[PDB]
Amino acid sequence: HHSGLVKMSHPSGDVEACMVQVTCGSMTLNGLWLDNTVWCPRHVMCPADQLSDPNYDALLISMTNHSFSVQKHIANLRVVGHAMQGTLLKLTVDVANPSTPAYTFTTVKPGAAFSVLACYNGRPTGTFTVVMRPNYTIKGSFLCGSCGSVGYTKEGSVINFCYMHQMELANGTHTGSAFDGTMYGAFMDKQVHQVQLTDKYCSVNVVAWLYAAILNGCAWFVKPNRTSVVSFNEWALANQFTEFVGTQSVDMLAVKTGVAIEQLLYAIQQLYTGFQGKQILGSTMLEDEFTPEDVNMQIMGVV
Amino acid sequence: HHSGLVKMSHPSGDVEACMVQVTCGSMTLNGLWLDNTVWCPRHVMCPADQLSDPNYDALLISMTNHSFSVQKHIANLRVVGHAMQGTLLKLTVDVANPSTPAYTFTTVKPGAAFSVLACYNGRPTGTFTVVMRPNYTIKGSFLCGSCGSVGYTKEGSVINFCYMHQMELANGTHTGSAFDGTMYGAFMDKQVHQVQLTDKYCSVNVVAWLYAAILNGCAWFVKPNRTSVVSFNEWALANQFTEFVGTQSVDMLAVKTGVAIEQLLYAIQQLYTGFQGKQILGSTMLEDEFTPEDVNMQIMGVV
Ligand SMILES: *[C@@H](O)[C@H](C[C@@H]1CCNC1=O)NC(=O)[C@H](CC(C)C)NC(=O)OC[C@H]1C[C@@H]1C1CCCCC1
Ligand SMILES: *[C@@H](O)[C@H](C[C@@H]1CCNC1=O)NC(=O)[C@H](CC(C)C)NC(=O)OC[C@H]1C[C@@H]1C1CCCCC1
DSSP states (O other): OOOOOOBBBBBOHHHTHHHHEEEEEEEEEEEEEEEEEEEEEEGGGOGGGGSOOOHHHHHHTOOOOOOOOOEEOOEOOOOOEHHHEETTEEEEEESTTTOOOOOOEEOOTTTEEEEEEEEEETEEEEEEEEEEOOOOOOOOOOOOOOOOOHHHHHTTTEEEEEEEEEEEESSEEEEEOOTTSOBBTTTSSSSOOOOOOOOOOOOOHHHHHHHEEEETOOTTTSSSSSOOHHHHHHHHHHTTBOOOOOOHHHHHHHHHHHHHHHHHHHHHHHHOOOTOOOTTTTBBSSOSOOOHHHHHHHOOOOO | OOOOOOBBBBBHHHTTEEEEEEEEHHHEEEEEETTEEEEGGGGGGGGGGGGGSOOOOHHTTTTGGOOEEOOOOOEEEOEEEEEEEETEEEEEEEOOOOOOOOEEEEETTTTTTTEEEEETTEEEEEEEEEEOEEETBBBBOOTTTOOOOEEEEEEEEEEEEEEEEEEEEEEEHHHHHTTTTTTTTTOOOSSSSSOOOOOOBOOOHHHHHHHHHHHHOOTTOOOOOOOOHHHHHHHHTTTBBOOOOHHHHHHHHHHOOOOOOOHHHHHHHHHHTTOOOBBBTSSSSOOSOOOOOHHHHTTTTTO
């Protein structure tokens, strides 16, 4: 039986019309054009021989307006102002984007999913969805020239930009910046080795996934036994699980299936020690890349 | 270590501008507007009390041009002609779509991936990628009102439309029509129980995935032993695997890694009997939802 769950990304058309190319003569990467502003990673100012320990303050002051070349590839935007906000540049251009969607800037939290538009030379090439890992990495698909690719969610017709790609880690995962300029987690936009925090199972997403199995007729794991939220979180600390915090989306799943959150917290404790040769939605390991909102939307048709 | 592999869909913007709403007063579903033509599933003509055994020939002749209401939701298109091609309708409208992309119609084969734009009331709501299963189903995410949602691939700037969604099967998977009007496999667009063919591992995609592991430093399974293509296909018949057929995309992976196709065919035979407690790219079961082209593009940056 198929769960009806897929990695679902938002339609990318609105964000495609906001992508541009930004180059300083050394690096070429992507920028996000909204109204008269173009956002892009600041290491575009960084020469090839300075990516490991740049002085961005000295690099910024060394730049002028025409130091930045901004190009629409699917035109030329004259830069009339430039500023630095943390790990991002805020370029002011003479023409405003006539296709600027309604948007906000928002930081995304661990366990929440968002859609990414991978671009190269300002040309969108593919879209996918990821969940922010507890260690503030994402398991994306990025190559050289992908920096400036953006991640976002959508509430109604409003696009909530939450991620601009910056780099890849030694273990293959990726991280980037929020549009307030900060990097997620404790990462720095410097091409050097960096400490990486441990990853953890997103307990709330594991609960959403077990609810998806029940909604598809799969419930062998559901036992009448219960684990309280308090006792589970204490258990979670000693087993590399995130601490569980219920939401209205999870409560809706509990009402629909008739299975209380606490029953599944007990199941997670038992399934973590082993599946005992059985499968859940065609899997032998716990899944945490689907959110409660993904289950409500894709299976129950509720947004 | 992260493989760098994600379910990667094409950017949906070009196809978003082609979606419309089509209704006959009973069902509401989606249509694809290209030039002066709107394609949609033919069961839009079907009353609610006739979805299990309709007479589409009698239903079509019972319709006139103004029987069909076509609406753009992101306008009204006056229908000036209507025709039936297999399981699809071919509506002719007075205005041509000014955003018609360069396109072709192409049938997709088992094991090949394509991107789907899920729409409701002509409004695009999400995009995802699937592989055509050997039994001509897809493991998608579709609810009521999703029919008319389209699947496609992209060669350059040319969009190759390959799928229009029609129905869901009893086991939860989905199937639909090619744009020549035929349903994939032996399925019929009738809301009745239907025989379902067995699913199989896509051997060529399993080989692509093992190559992705090698490209990420994971090769414990690679033994010097080899299985020939001929002997593997004979084995495949008795084990619910597709018969392997190499391509240039697979040969490129063999050259890059230095591991011959035949070594991995032997590995598949051994891994199928059990992983022996080890993991490949964080998995304990064979993966076949990534194509050789996915590995070449996402990891090697080759299209
Ligand atoms: C965009 O410019 C680019 C996107 C990267 C390249 C490959 N995959 C991606 O996602 N970003 C970078 O090249 C950054 C630039 C720095 C200044 C932020 N650098 C980077 O991503 O490093 C690649 C990691 C392999 C490197 C580190 C591993 C451990 C030893 C130190 C280097
Ligand atoms: C689009 O109109 C819609 C999309 C479906 C609905 C739910 N998920 C989907 O992908 N398509 C349908 O409703 C078709 C219409 C027929 C005329 C082609 N019917 C359908 O999808 O049936 C749903 C399967 C549960 C039904 C069968 C299971 C086994 C017993 C017979 C019915």
